[PDB]
Symmetry: C2
Subunit: 271 residues, 2 copies
């Protein structure tokens, strides 16, 4: 039965994410389910009831086409004229391409010789305030520097079992003083549904010229796509955040050990 | 029990070979048990060696390799070795300097590797691929062009029985006129594509065009260049699933598709099944 969930991290606009079944659409054969997948639609303004947006999404005729680039890809495009979902018409009518392993549990099972549809079965809406969200650019997150210390976080979620994931905040040039500096940042955390499951961080306090990091979104789709697929239709809660200071460049992992900081001085606030 | 496999795609007497290890990420503190956290891999790269595979395996199993979980854009695993080398000296750059990998490409469950306990990579299996490698750059494979036709391949493997398919992107060509089913089939046949499996990153596809290359196809298939397509890049999840299994190519189909997503609505896929010997499998 289709269901809708509204998530408000709380740190008009709303990010819409659909979950559904990739299945055969030829009316001469059965609608055989090939894979379970997702369709991130992005941000858009809407004052419609979530149950009304869900009802329209379930009535859409969405086509899935498997293709390749560097890796397996899925192209999604819609055939049904829109009414309440007109804020997301750019993605639905222009069509979009995704990394298949990020939006699909088994792309290798989707056939090329038989037309496919994406039967929407579930919707997730994340309430926002800027008409989008801010993410750290890929080049900044992937950058490694000699004689630097990476400020990372190990976040533990309780799945309503536990699951952990690591986040990279930034780097600093190379003790109890670090625990106080992190407290001075005034970091606040919340979960969202950007790409399935996402972490939202906002620094309410003071920062010493970070330049990498006012609210950052860290979608689990980018951090660990496999775990993100596993948590697609589950309620999550942050139950622990630990700071993990580590070396940046791999040749320095031999020289410098990790320093794990546990929150005992109001370092991190979870909403 | 540790085992070693030698794979020869067969597409030189210089003894160049790619080494790839499989093993268990486990607790290394001697005060606690060696609890297995995750199964993973360690691609070591290319190196010259005339040592027996069983001798290279024996040395690899004796190495003290440290695993350190970390983050960037995504979950990472850093591997570095503590044991002095003898036969594995050709792979000393990766082993001594240390290397970082995308955890989902070299590990089945990175979220299960703890940060509060030292970790080790206990080598349990080795895979050597004999070489005479070249890969298409990421920017070329990911590039999408308006009014273009992507020349892709759907490869089916039999896991020695169950099957698995994967798609490969060869190159793009301008959309003109409509090429017939027999015209494109004839052009593909003229390329003389030859295929073989290797072990680059676990499982890999090796393509060589022995015939004449199309003057209209924008691809990196040179006159006598062997392109390597590691399944680690194509479908990292399927590549992990096939880590310790024998594979065989049982079907190759050409799939001509549009390039930009807005053209999937307008143009359909054209599947060209292998008859006439478009694709030779070794």
């Amino acid at each position: 039965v289709p269901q809708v969930r509204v998530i408000d991290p709380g740190l008009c606009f709303m990010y819409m994410f659909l979950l559904g079944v990739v299945e055969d659409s030829d009316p001469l054969g059965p609608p055989i389910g090939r894979a379970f997948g997702s369709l991130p639609l992005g941000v858009g303004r809407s004052t419609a009831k979530p149950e009304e947006l869900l009802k329209e999404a379930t009535e859409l005729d969405i086509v899935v086409r498997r293709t390749a680039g560097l890796n397996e890809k899925l192209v999604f495009y819609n055939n049904t004229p829109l009414t309440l979902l007109t804020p997301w018409r750019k993605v639905l009518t222009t069509g979009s391409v995704f990394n298949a392993n990020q939006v699909c549990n088994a792309v290798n099972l989707i056939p090329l010789d038989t037309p496919q549809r994406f039967r929407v079965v579930y919707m997730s809406i994340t309430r926002l305030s800027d008409n989008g969200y801010y993410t750290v650019p890929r080049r900044m997150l992937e950058f490694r520097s000699v004689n630097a210390v990476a400020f990372n976080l190990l976040v533990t979620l309780r799945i309503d079992p536990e699951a952990t994931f690591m986040v990279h905040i930034g780097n600093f040039r190379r003790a109890d003083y670090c625990k106080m500096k992190i407290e001075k940042m005034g970091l606040v955390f919340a979960l969202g549904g950007i790409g399935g499951t996402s972490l939202h961080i906002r620094s309410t306090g003071k920062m010493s010229k970070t330049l990498h990091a006012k609210t950052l979104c860290y979608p689990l789709m980018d951090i660990n796509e496999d775990l993100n697929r596993l948590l697609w239709r589950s309620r999550c809660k942050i139950v622990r955040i630990q700071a993990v200071l580590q070396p940046s460049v791999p040749q320095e992992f031999r020289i410098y050990d990790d320093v794990i900081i546990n929150d005992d001085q109001g370092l991190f606030k979870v909403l």
